[PDB]
């Protein structure tokens, strides 16, 4: 699903869920364990904002 066609300039780049990498399964054998990414999988447009050092979107108990 691409980003909506306005003037923004996303092109055909996929729109992926706005979720932090911290939410990914930490026990799975990621090709990039620190990023929790697999080689060849599409990267979220804002991946650099969703690294584990930055913005977390994990469920909260409250």
């Amino acid at each position: 699903e691409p980003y909506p066609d306005d003037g923004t300039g996303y092109g055909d780049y996929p729109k992926l869920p706005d979720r932090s990498q911290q939410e990914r399964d930490p026990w799975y054998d990621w090709d990039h364990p620190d990023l929790r990414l697999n080689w060849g999988e599409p990267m979220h447009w804002d991946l650099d904002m969703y690294i584990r050092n930055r913005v977390d979107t994990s469920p909260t108990p409250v």
């Binding site: 090709d31 990039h32 364990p33 620190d34 990023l35 080689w39 650099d48 904002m49 050092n53």
Partner: protein
């Protein structure tokens, strides 16, 4: 200045008449000797500048820029000789010749007494710089980067030519010593508004001012390492040096004409600093860092106070060494992984321990840790803009926070964390690379022990 112009010229017959395998050894050795003799320009007086002849003079502003310029040439030869190893001999010598000719123009540019002579040499530096980027840049987009670089400069510099010739007709001279005494105040009028813009825009484009900066991230991402070093270290400072001189003859109109450019710089530095937090290409990140640091210099020059002029000079020298270091550090990673993507190779402190120390030291100077001259320059500007208007401290303070965040973000992302599993060619740091890093940081940190020599005429 002939004692520096002639030996600089002699570097070209030396390179072309050297043995095939000794072009790097010979050009590096003798350009270091030239750099050594450049310390004689420190004969500066409290009242008068060092006026050599009718063509060339040196003062406390041009002297530090001259020494930085001549120091960078051997560093550029060190940085370039590896990625040029496959290049055939004649083209290697042509590359070195372009670097030498760039230095010759630069040392004449910074010491030219007459402003039209300064203009011609100021323009001449474009030619070799454009050749270095377009001929020896690596990617397809170097051709576009060459065009943007060329036409951004000329769009501003041609109006400067008309203004300069106009001033000489009206005043009778463009000699900078003459203008110091025959300067007359600039009265309000629409003619003088455009004379002011013609006198300033060319230097703004080179700094670069926010809004006219889009050519610079392009130029860096496409230039070879030596191109990036000279671009960041010296070529940006042609604008600052030009502004510091020409503002003499623009008073008191600068009082109100500077407002739009102070707003662009003050807001520009926060935007470009924020942009650095999201850059994915390491060279592009360093390029945007330069725009933010030079936005401080524009503000300092435009508010014209002794503290701001001293801070502007120190910042120009300090940024020259720091940004040149950062490009060299990023290039040394590129020569291994052949990608500028910051997130590609991580955890390099585990694999290259000593290179991570250079990364730490460069980052600390970039965020202006006291008592580095990076901090001295930034602090002096912050002090002077506070008097100009107390509210500027909020913008200055926010930029300091963002600057620390992106400087340490760059250090953390590339050096810390876990190493990338499949990147298995991270060979140990070469002696050449380690020496190149230390030849940046060591003079930079030594200057902290005697900062007065980089504080400029207002000291």
């Amino acid at each position: 200045m002939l004692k520096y112009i002639i030996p600089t010229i002699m570097l070209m017959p030396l390179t072309w008449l050297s043995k095939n395998n000794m072009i790097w050894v010979n050009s590096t050795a003798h350009s270091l000797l030239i750099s050594f003799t450049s310390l004689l320009l420190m004969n500066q007086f409290g009242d008068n500048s060092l006026n050599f002849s009718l063509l060339f003079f040196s003062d406390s502003l041009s002297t530090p820029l001259l020494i930085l310029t001549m120091w960078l040439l051997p560093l550029m030869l060190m940085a370039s000789q590896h990625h040029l190893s496959k290049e055939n001999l004649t083209r290697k010598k042509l590359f070195i010749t372009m670097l030498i000719s760039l230095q010759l123009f630069l040392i004449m540019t910074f010491t030219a007494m007459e402003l039209i002579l300064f203009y011609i040499l100021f323009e001449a530096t474009l030619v070799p710089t454009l050749i270095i980027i377009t001929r020896w840049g690596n990617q397809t987009e170097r051709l576009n980067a060459g065009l943007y670089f060329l036409f951004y400069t000329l769009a501003g510099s041609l109006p400067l030519l008309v203004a300069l010739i106009y001033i000489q007709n009206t005043v009778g001279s463009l000699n900078f010593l003459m203008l110091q005494y025959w300067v007359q105040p600039v009265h309000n009028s629409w003619s003088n508004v455009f004379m002011w813009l013609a006198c300033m825009m060319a230097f703004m484009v080179k700094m670069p001012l926010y809004g006219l900066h889009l050519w610079l991230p392009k130029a860096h991402v496409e230039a070879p390492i030596a191109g990036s070093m000279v671009l960041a270290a010296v070529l940006l400072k042609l604008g600052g040096y030009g502004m510091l001189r020409i503002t003499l003859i623009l008073n008191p109109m600068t009082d109100f004409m500077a407002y739009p450019f102070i707003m662009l710089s003050l807001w520009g530095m926060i935007m470009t600093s924020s942009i650095c937090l999201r850059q994915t290409d390491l060279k592009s990140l360093i390029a945007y860092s330069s725009v933010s640091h030079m936005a401080l210099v524009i503000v300092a020059i435009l508010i014209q106070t002794p503290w701001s002029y001293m801070g502007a000079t120190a910042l120009m020298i300090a940024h020259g060494l720091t940004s040149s270091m950062l490009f060299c550090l990023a290039n040394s990673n590129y020569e291994r992984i052949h990608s500028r993507t910051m997130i590609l190779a991580r955890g390099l402190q585990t694999l290259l321990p000593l290179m991570a120390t250079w990364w730490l030291l460069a980052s600390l100077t970039n965020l202006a840790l006291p008592p580095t001259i990076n901090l001295i320059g930034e602090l002096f500007v912050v002090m002077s803009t506070f008097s100009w208007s107390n509210i500027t401290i909020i913008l200055m303070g926010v930029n300091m926070v963002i600057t620390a965040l992106y400087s340490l973000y760059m250090l953390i992302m590339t050096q810390r964390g876990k190493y990338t599993y499949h990147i298995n060619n991270i060979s140990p740091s070469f002696t050449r690379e380690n020496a190149l890093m230390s030849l940046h940081i060591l003079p930079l940190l030594l200057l902290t022990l005697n900062p007065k020599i980089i504080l400029g005429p207002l000291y």
